[PDB]
Amino acid sequence: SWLTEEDIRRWESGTFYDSYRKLGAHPDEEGTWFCVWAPHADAVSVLGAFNNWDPEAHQLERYGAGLWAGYVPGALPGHAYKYRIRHGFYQADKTDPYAFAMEPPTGSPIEGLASIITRLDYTWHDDAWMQRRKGPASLYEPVSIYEVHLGSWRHKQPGVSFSYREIAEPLADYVQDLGFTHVELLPIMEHPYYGSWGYQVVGYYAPTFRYGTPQDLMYLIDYLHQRGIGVILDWVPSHFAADPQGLVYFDGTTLFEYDDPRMRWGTYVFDYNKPGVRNFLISNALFWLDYYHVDGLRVDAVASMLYRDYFGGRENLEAIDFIKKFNETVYLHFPEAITIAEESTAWPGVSAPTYNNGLGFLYKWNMGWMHDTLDYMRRDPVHRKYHHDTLTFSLWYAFSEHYILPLSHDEVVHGKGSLWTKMPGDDWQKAANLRLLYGHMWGHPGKKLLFMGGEFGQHHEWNHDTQLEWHLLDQPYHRGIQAWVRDLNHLYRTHPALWHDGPEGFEWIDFNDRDQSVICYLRKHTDRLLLFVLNFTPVPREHYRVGVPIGGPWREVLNSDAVAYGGSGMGNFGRVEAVPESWHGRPFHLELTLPPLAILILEPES
Amino acid sequence: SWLTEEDIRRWESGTFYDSYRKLGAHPDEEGTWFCVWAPHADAVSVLGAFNNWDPEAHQLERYGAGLWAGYVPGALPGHAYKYRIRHGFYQADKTDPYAFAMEPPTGSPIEGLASIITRLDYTWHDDAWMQRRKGPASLYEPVSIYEVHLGSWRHKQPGVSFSYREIAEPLADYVQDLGFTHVELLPIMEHPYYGSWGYQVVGYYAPTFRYGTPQDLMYLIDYLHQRGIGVILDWVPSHFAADPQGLVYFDGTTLFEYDDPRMRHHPDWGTYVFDYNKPGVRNFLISNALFWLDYYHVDGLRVDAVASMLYRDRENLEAIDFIKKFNETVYLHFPEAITIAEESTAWPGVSAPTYNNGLGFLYKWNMGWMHDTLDYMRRDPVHRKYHHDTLTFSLWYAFSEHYILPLSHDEVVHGKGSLWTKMPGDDWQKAANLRLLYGHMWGHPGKKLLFMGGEFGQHHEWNHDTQLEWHLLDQPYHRGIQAWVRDLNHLYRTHPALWHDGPEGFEWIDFNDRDQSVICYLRKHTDRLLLFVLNFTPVPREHYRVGVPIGGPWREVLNSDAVAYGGSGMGNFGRVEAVPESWHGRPFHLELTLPPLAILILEPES
């Protein structure tokens, strides 16, 4: 038999988190084994070049739990196959839900995306990374994510993306120069419409064909690890793609869909009640962490799962227990994995452990911060006076979850304007505004995420059909933003005062200068201190006194206005002797000159 | 009330493993608390400048469990103090057993040592290291220990050692350059006799004054961590110093020594041995272990002369249970510490968990390997034929425990001769042999330990009263050996095939070329494999064939006979293509040229 009798029982249980070991296509040297979940199927057959595409050649046999199994001699790696499932009167051809690679027969994905029998043999050379990897313990380490869409990042030539293999070395080299710790990849799972960016997924178990083979993707991940970079994958349990050959009405009935019409994006939601659906999804989560050494999983649009109308009420329990058991299972099997959730409701305890009634994610996107911060900085400096509370109040909500600061691709697309485009004033000020924003984002509590091109201050919105405007890296302002982001990341990676985003890690210095739009705050761990002085107005401020707890010489660690970043060059000497009398209720104070639209980061000596 | 009633009960159970929180001298803001264990004392008094050394000025009060405690206003850090204990008719002055710092009023440690009140506030900068310390998992990682006597390493001026601080940057630069992962420091705990090397200990809780303050040592340990170096401390629970004011007959009776007269005399340690029966002794020792890992962030503790604890000549269950609970508490409170033992008997399960009836150490010195290897290469190449079995049979014992292949200070002393001195022939061949020894030791399964000065092959036995013969780094033969060790450690740090010391990590290629004294073996993890071919004769061998598992281009990753190491320059030169001919029972074979007295390490080409 293909299936152990314990297996079937686990599938009925909903506990088969190894299910990729048995479902899908698994080759031998003499043939391939096939296993399908089709509970309301009266018959199932595998069709392929290996058997005349004849529906009667290899009729899989019905086992328990709606599972079908069969062996086909001569079905070999690199063939395409297809399931012909019969629901009573009607018959239909379907793709493998567990397909490990899918490849278009036509050459165009939106036309056809067929399953290919594949062997997943790959040898890793990332032992050192995987032995030192730290998931949940990363709360006390700097986490700086570079978010990437692979096809859009760089083009080998106009309109043709870099392969997985070919992308590895350019991506690793650039990420290391930036100082980013992780790369977040928009969904890699097989999808027909390239314009979906991967969020409409048909092949959950198949890395997209456009950038190479499955093992090509592992080589990329393997390479990135040896270079010391983490890989977080975007994962879409929220919904499945609307493709007829895909998961939609697999048996001729609702299967991955809700059986009930009333509930169910529409219709193309996963029925989290079904034990098989929870199996399929949770196994896929571990599958990526298991076979591809993925460091983290990021779940988007959690609110669409948590509620039903985004006495039973709005909340969907099915989804919350699945989300909870999803996170529990990940951390049980991979204690150093990372789970990130984006939830646009104020659902509490997203970042909380399940045993405290939380969803069990390690991180939550602080999109409130993103909105508030962005709403603040588009406003003209004359007006930032009138909205001072938008900036300062971001910290009242900054500790409700373990948060990642969320500057994201969604923010720079659909008319929202490039981050650069968003900033006000002439070109010098926009580069200044962008340097200030990044400075404040790194100072603000929480982990940092920046999408491709934000590190240049790219002019145009993200277009998936092209590569980012790397040509702007030649004009001075834009290499300066890049130099600024790198220097911020180097400061971030080294100073432990920035690693602790708990309320302990922050102290207010001053937030009352609404008229001058100035903010002074402290970031602390143990003895170590970092002082942040921020000018959101062009008007340079002279003899601006800023209270500090410790006296003595202070150093100017970073100056947003240094010419190396494209600034006016207005700066403190870098040697600053503290005045022994009070300011802002503090024993000493630093008297500085605040450069235009700039951030000063200052540290005491030894 | 200095002592909680919970404090008294835990001390009575011998379960007070934080006992340093309360015993000894603890400075207050206006005075000092003193707490001493003297169960059979009728009176105990604190003497110091802070009371003009008057014995009736501050008489400690008896609490339960024989613990004495009292407060002295005006006793401040940097004050020297003394306990006056009255045993009936007789009175005696004693040092603090829990003294956290000691200094000699005379300025000679032997003539006198004094307990000085110290405050241990120190602000650490080793965040990244200790959040990433792998400890037990280090068994799967490369561990290369550089064993060091701090006073002997380098002298800042003739006959003057470096301070804890002064040594930090010179040593860390050296250890980083040579690629060792950890440094093991010969006992730094306060000791009267410098010539003891620290193994006769008076002040278990005080780092020796010779190199500076406690915080001075903290800077070094902090410093090395920032540089990525682990620190293992040598720890002596077997015996205390035979010093009259020290722990000998502390309260006027046998206290830290065994009460029984027959038990009191032990052949290696004479009258002074720790009475592991006493719960108070168990506290003092296990608290001390945790104290070093707690306040000094040390990564490991290495226990010497474990056989002297286990036997009395036979089994000492007191010592065996103390040993077991020592290891259990260590890993319970500091899961990423490392504990190492040297045992001169074949006692089983030194490296095994207590729950499997082991002693609970993580690592054991492979002294069998050391004696065997040294015995073999001490002998002349003409004779090595007749002792081939001594070389090859070393691996029958290499997987019995988790082993650290150790060449130590004890080997290079007392007329045993330098490692260099140990090797046969003239200087060229001696240097060749030493490159071979290090070559095989890095190839042989197990972690690696090399004592200071061995890395260049210094001539004279290690003399503690002087600094190493660094001037030999000017002569080529020794500068070559140091380069060879560096390259060996780099290979070790980068190749995971050397990290797994299980039997799975080793495969024999051929061992029966006894006549020509050549051995070939494989160090393999997963797909990765490293081929070691060793010629223990000064005649090079040509057209020597070596079987291989995989056929294809192979590269030569290391050649001991490379001119950079002081060698002939003989070698395959790379581009070695396995010949699809069977040899040594293997499918393919390599036709190699074996240089004189040399080690080859070869990798297939990817």
The nearest CA of chain B is from the CA of A139 a distance in Å of 11
Are residues A199 and A154 in contact, defined by beta-carbon separation less than 8 angstroms? no
**Would an 8 Å CB–CB cutoff place B606 in contact with chain A?**
no
Decide if B125 and A528 are in contact by the 8 Å CB cutoff. Answer: yes
Decide if B127 and A496 are in contact by the 8 Å CB cutoff. Answer: yes
Cross-chain CB nearest to A132 (options B124, B134, B526): B134
Decide if B131 and A128 are in contact by the 8 Å CB cutoff. Answer: no
The residue ranges of DSSP E strands in A482-527, in sequence order, are 506-513, 518-525
Structure tokens given for A131: 């032995």
DSSP B396-445: GGTTSS-EEEEE-TTTTSTTS--HHHHS-SSHHHHHHHHHHHHHHHHHSS
Structure tokens given for A389: 């509370």
Helix B164-178 / helix B476-494 crossing angle, nearest 10 deg: 80
Decide if A496 and B140 are in contact by the 8 Å CB cutoff. Answer: no
Question: Which residues of chain A are within 8 Å of residue B523 when distances are taken between CB atoms?
Answer: none
Are residues A272 and A319 in contact, defined by beta-carbon separation less than 8 angstroms? yes
Rg (CA), chain B: 27
Rg (CA), chain A: 27
**Would an 8 Å CB–CB cutoff place B123 in contact with chain A?**
yes
Cross-chain CB nearest to A123 (options B125, B499, B527): B527
The nearest CA of chain A is from the CA of B546 a distance in Å of 25
DSSP tag of B578: P
Decide if A141 and B123 are in contact by the 8 Å CB cutoff. Answer: no
The nearest CA of chain A is from the CA of B360 a distance in Å of 23
Task: Please give the Cα distance from B197 to A63 (Å, whole number).
Answer: 73
The nearest CA of chain A is from the CA of B605 a distance in Å of 14
Q: Is B153 helix (H, G, I), strand (E, B) or coil?
A: helix
Decide if B137 and A131 are in contact by the 8 Å CB cutoff. Answer: yes
Q: Which residue, among B131, B223, B227, B494, would best test binding to A if mutated, counting the most A CBs under 10 Å from its CB? A: B131
**Would an 8 Å CB–CB cutoff place A496 in contact with chain B?**
yes
Are residues B232 and B340 in contact, defined by beta-carbon separation less than 8 angstroms? yes
Q: Is B229 helix (H, G, I), strand (E, B) or coil?
A: coil
Question: Which residues of chain B are within 8 Å of residue A528 when distances are taken between CB atoms?
Answer: 125
Question: Which residues of chain A are within 8 Å of residue B141 when distances are taken between CB atoms?
Answer: 128, 131
Decide if A127 and B525 are in contact by the 8 Å CB cutoff. Answer: yes
Are residues B302 and B232 in contact, defined by beta-carbon separation less than 8 angstroms? yes
Burial class (CB in 10 A: 0-12, 13-18, 19+), A387: middle
Question: Which residues of chain B are within 8 Å of residue A527 when distances are taken between CB atoms?
Answer: 123
Are residues A452 and A149 in contact, defined by beta-carbon separation less than 8 angstroms? yes
**Would an 8 Å CB–CB cutoff place B499 in contact with chain A?**
yes
Burial class (CB in 10 A: 0-12, 13-18, 19+), B203: buried
B525, A330, A39, A13 alpha-carbon torsion, rounded to 10°: 100
What are residue B155's DSSP bridge partners? Answer: B161
What are residue B531's DSSP bridge partners? Answer: B522, B602
**Would an 8 Å CB–CB cutoff place B53 in contact with chain A?**
no
Task: Specify the DSSP element, H or E, that contains A364.
Answer: strand A363-365
Nearest to A251 by CA among A60, A64, A45, A40: A40
Task: Please give the Cα distance from B297 to B130 (Å, whole number).
Answer: 8
Active-site annotation holds for A300: yes
Decide if B140 and A131 are in contact by the 8 Å CB cutoff. Answer: yes
Question: Which residues of chain A are within 8 Å of residue B131 when distances are taken between CB atoms?
Answer: 134, 137, 140-141
Task: Specify the DSSP element, H or E, that contains A276.
Answer: helix A275-291
Decide if B496 and A127 are in contact by the 8 Å CB cutoff. Answer: yes
What are residue B402's DSSP bridge partners? Answer: none
**Would an 8 Å CB–CB cutoff place A134 in contact with chain B?**
yes
The phi and psi torsions of B377 (rounded to 5 degrees) equal -85, -15
CB proximity list for B353: less than 8 A, separation 6 or greater: B360
Active site residues of B: 304, 342
Nearest to B428 by CA among B477, B469, B382: B477
CB proximity list for A70: less than 8 A, separation 6 or greater: A2, A33, A34, A35, A46, A58, A59, A60, A61
Task: Please give the Cα distance from A542 to B346 (Å, whole number).
Answer: 76
Q: Is A490 helix (H, G, I), strand (E, B) or coil?
A: helix
Question: Which residues of chain B are within 8 Å of residue A181 when distances are taken between CB atoms?
Answer: none
Are residues B398 and B445 in contact, defined by beta-carbon separation less than 8 angstroms? yes
